[PDB]
């Protein structure tokens, strides 16, 4: 049965939310923090900004809703509800999405500070547990950084995507290589992990060249095996035109760090992506012996990327989105 809605104005915009959600307060752009009374959880409610104004906005609205409907895992963000005040497609013009309100991001939790080895273990273990799921769905995050990592007081973590940044991106992404695989996320984790242990940004670049200048200093200049894989002539010509760097010994970079954490970093921060560890592989690594459980690191039913990359008319995205809203099954209660 259709819930009774209530109208309230917040943040230069009218909001029509069901009775369920209470004490709506703006947290930034539009999203409000709120209390859900059916479940008892504090929730974040995002109103989709101008959803069907352009083809892009509409295509973008559908992608999010679908993807998040399919995302059902504890270390990946999910949907507690999705709703519209529309009683009919022809009056359909706004979309709201709901999830557990989350305390802080990985900067806010504790970033500037040097976390303990046991604590780092738990966090990285979780990211990896989430990445296994997202990857099995054939999805690549492409933008893993701490500001995309939601974490409560208990330090339970969920991966998310907010639709300095350049510090965590795989080298190939900076060089605008336009074929890449899932291990660009493994690089990001590598960086995130290095930081958690040291309290220090691994690669605190000032611009794009500086960024790659820094990355090479740690991992070394590309070997003749990697050299053979660069497609672009000009690019190859430039890599030759560099002074040879030796791979820095990680032991000396991460002084006194648990050498299990070092070996793991060795395996993530590998310039050639084909040889980086996979999320699945990393969960098996001794470093997470105190957390790893192969019977509870589940995968996703595979996901249709091709459905979100289409030349559709406005009304066609609007109707496919509406259908998704109608077809929404909430997750079973606690
Ligand atoms: C699953 C994974 C990480 C791949 C993922 C997760 C998300 N989505 C996501 O992170 N959403 C978030 N939004 C905020 C700010 C708003 O308040 C939170 C909030 C309140 C209520 C409900 C949800 C969120 C923080 S986290 N995308 C994603 C997919 C498509 C697009 C569209 C495009 O393609 O541009 C953009 C992102 N991919
Ligand atoms: C400064 C020069 C550093 C080059 C960094 C990019 C090398 C990353 O590795 C490359 O990743 C590509 C994209 O996934 C793959 O197609 C290649 O197989 C792999 O060699």
């Amino acid at each position: 049965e259709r819930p009774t809605f209530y109208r309230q104005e917040l943040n230069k915009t009218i909001w029509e939310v069901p009775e369920r959600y209470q004490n709506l307060s703006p947290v930034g752009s539009s999203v409000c923090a709120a209390f859900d009374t059916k479940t008892g959880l504090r929730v974040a409610v995002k109103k989709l900004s101008r959803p069907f104004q352009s083809i892009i906005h509409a295509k973008r609205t559908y992608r999010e809703l679908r993807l998040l409907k399919h995302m059902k895992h504890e270390n990946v963000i999910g949907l507690l509800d999705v709703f519209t005040p529309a009683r009919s497609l022809e009056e359909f013009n706004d979309v709201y999405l709901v999830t557990h309100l989350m305390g802080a991001d990985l900067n806010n939790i504790v970033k500037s500070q040097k976390l303990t080895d046991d604590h780092v273990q738990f966090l990285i273990y979780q990211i990896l547990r989430g990445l296994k799921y997202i990857h099995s769905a054939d999805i690549i995050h492409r933008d893993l950084k701490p500001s995309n990592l939601a974490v409560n007081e208990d330090s339970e973590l969920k991966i998310l995507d907010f639709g300095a940044t350049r510090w965590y991106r795989a080298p190939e992404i900076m060089l605008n290589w336009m074929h890449y695989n899932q291990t660009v996320d493994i690089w990001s984790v590598g960086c995130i992990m290095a930081e958690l242990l040291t309290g220090r940004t691994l690669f605190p670049g000032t611009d794009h060249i500086d960024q790659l200048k820094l990355i090479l200093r740690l991992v070394g200049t590309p070997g003749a095996e990697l050299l053979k894989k660069i497609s672009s002539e000009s690019a190859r010509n430039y890599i030759q035109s560099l002074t040879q760097m030796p791979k820095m010994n990680f032991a000396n970079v991460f002084i006194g760090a648990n050498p299990l954490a070092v070996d793991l970093l060795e395996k993530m921060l590998v310039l050639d992506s084909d040889k980086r560890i996979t999320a699945a592989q990393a969960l098996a690594h001794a470093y997470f012996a105190q957390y790893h459980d192969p019977d509870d690191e589940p995968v996703a039913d595979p996901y249709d990327q091709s459905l979100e990359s289409r030349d559709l008319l406005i009304d066609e995205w609007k109707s496919l989105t509406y259908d998704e809203v109608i077809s929404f099954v909430p997750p079973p209660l606690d």
Side-chain angles (χ1 to χ4, degrees), residues 2-108 110 112-334:
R2 184 192 189 275
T4 303
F5 281 79
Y6 80 85
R7 192 189 287 271
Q8 186 188 345
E9 180 216 351
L10 308 94
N11 208 153
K12 342 284 199 196
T13 169
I14 317 300
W15 279 54
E16 200 150 323
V17 325
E19 279 183 326
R20 184 182 182 160
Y21 307 104
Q22 289 287 330
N23 324 328
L24 259 56
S25 85
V27 289
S29 297
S30 52
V31 191
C32 285
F35 191 76
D36 184 344
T37 44
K38 270 208 166 207
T39 125
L41 295 163
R42 313 203 219 85
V43 283
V45 179
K46 177 209 242 184
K47 181 172 172 191
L48 302 200
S49 167
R50 322 176 158 290
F52 316 105
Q53 177 209 96
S54 49
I55 284 182
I56 308 306
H57 271 56
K59 192 218 275 169
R60 210 167 267 168
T61 293
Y62 170 91
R63 165 155 200 264
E64 208 167 5
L65 220 204
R66 265 200 107 242
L67 222 199
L68 291 180
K69 279 188 75 181
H70 198 77
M71 294 299 99
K72 286 160 185 162
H73 181 291
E74 336 191 0
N75 309 118
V76 185
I77 196 197
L79 285 168
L80 260 22
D81 199 31
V82 54
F83 67 90
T84 174
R87 304 202 202 205
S88 136
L89 167 73
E90 348 304 345
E91 74 166 306
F92 179 52
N93 203 203
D94 289 295
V95 177
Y96 299 82
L97 318 162
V98 192
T99 44
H100 321 246
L101 183 74
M102 227 79 182
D105 67 14
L106 209 63
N107 301 163
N108 202 350
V110 225
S112 293
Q113 289 316 296
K114 186 154 173 144
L115 298 188
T116 71
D117 197 80
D118 275 333
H119 194 207
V120 166
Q121 280 180 236
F122 190 46
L123 308 154
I124 304 308
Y125 173 81
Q126 297 184 78
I127 298 162
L128 294 172
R129 192 177 170 268
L131 261 191
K132 165 160 206 206
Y133 183 86
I134 290 162
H135 287 186
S136 53
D138 247 320
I139 313 162
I140 299 159
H141 187 114
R142 269 181 276 259
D143 195 37
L144 259 193
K145 61 202 173 175
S147 93
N148 270 146
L149 295 166
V151 202
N152 61 24
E153 255 216 317
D154 284 2
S155 323
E156 290 161 339
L157 158 154
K158 303 185 163 287
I159 303 165
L160 47 77
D161 194 12
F162 257 83
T165 308
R166 19 156 204 32
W167 289 348
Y168 303 89
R169 297 217 266 264
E172 56 267 49
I173 286 175
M174 324 230 70
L175 297 171
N176 228 65
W177 228 276
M178 264 214 258
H179 329 255
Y180 43 64
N181 53 355
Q182 318 183 147
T183 47
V184 307
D185 298 345
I186 295 295
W187 182 266
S188 286
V189 180
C191 304
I192 292 165
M193 174 160 157
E195 195 161 333
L196 294 188
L197 300 156
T198 66
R200 195 148 245 319
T201 298
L202 219 198
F203 303 124
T206 69
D207 55 53
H208 277 235
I209 289 299
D210 192 46
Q211 195 82 57
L212 291 147
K213 251 196 138 211
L214 284 168
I215 291 160
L216 288 178
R217 276 175 66 171
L218 177 61
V219 308
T221 24
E225 181 160 298
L226 212 182
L227 221 301
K228 282 185 275 166
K229 295 203 201 149
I230 331 296
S231 157
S232 179
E233 196 182 313
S234 61
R236 299 165 84 259
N237 314 328
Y238 179 68
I239 305 161
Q240 288 162 34
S241 294
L242 278 158
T243 311
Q244 209 78 211
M245 290 287 304
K247 195 200 105 281
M248 282 201 206
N249 192 224
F250 278 48
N252 300 293
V253 192
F254 305 94
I255 320 143
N258 171 4
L260 266 192
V262 169
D263 181 78
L264 211 209
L265 281 159
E266 285 281 6
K267 286 168 156 71
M268 291 178 151
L269 301 169
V270 191
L271 198 58
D272 178 18
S273 50
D274 302 315
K275 275 104 194 80
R276 291 163 198 173
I277 202 162
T278 75
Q281 282 158 355
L283 295 168
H285 189 280
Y287 189 59
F288 309 102
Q290 66 167 165
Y291 291 111
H292 174 232
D293 172 3
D295 298 317
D296 200 18
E297 291 165 348
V299 297
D301 319 323
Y303 180 79
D304 198 316
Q305 261 93 354
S306 64
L307 300 177
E308 44 187 51
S309 310
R310 298 197 300 228
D311 302 342
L312 308 184
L313 272 290
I314 292 271
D315 300 335
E316 300 182 298
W317 285 124
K318 191 160 185 163
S319 190
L320 290 169
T321 305
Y322 184 84
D323 285 325
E324 297 290 348
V325 165
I326 283 307
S327 61
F328 182 68
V329 187
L333 311 159
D334 315 340

